[PDB]
Amino acid sequence: KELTLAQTESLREVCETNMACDEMADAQGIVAAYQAFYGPIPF
Ligand SMILES: [Mg+2]
């Protein structure tokens, strides 16, 4: 389902310090970028 603002931001912070995630999230969105590097969202 839909993420809260804080949930989305928690994913964004992790991806921001991974240049490869960061770039991937540009066009793939934060969720698939997150999960591609870090696995299924846990919450
Ligand atoms: Mg933040």
Curated annotation (Swiss-Prot):
The lineage's top-level taxon is Eukaryota
* Gla domain: residues covered: 1-39
Q: Which residues bind Ca(2+) 3?
A: 16, 22
* Cysteine pairings via disulfide bonds: 15-21
PTM note:
Gamma-carboxyglutamate residues are formed by vitamin K dependent carboxylation by GGCX. These residues are essential for the binding of calcium.
Q: Which residues carry this modification: 4-carboxyglutamate?
A: 9, 13, 16, 23
> What subcellular compartments does it reside in?
Secreted
Expressed, tissue-wise, as follows: In the branchial arches, BGP is found outside the chondrocyte-containing zone. It is found in some cells in the basal zone of the branchial filaments, near the branchial arches, and within the extracellular matrix in the medial zone. In the vertebra, BGP is found in the mineralized bone matrix.
| Binding residue positions for Ca(2+) 2 | 13, 16
Where is Ca(2+) 1 bound in this sequence?
Answer: 9
> What does the record give as the function of this protein?
The carboxylated form is one of the main organic components of the bone matrix, which constitutes 1-2% of the total bone protein. The carboxylated form binds strongly to apatite and calcium.
Family membership, please give it: Belongs to the osteocalcin/matrix Gla protein family.
The molecule here is called Osteocalcin
Gene from which the chain derives: bglap
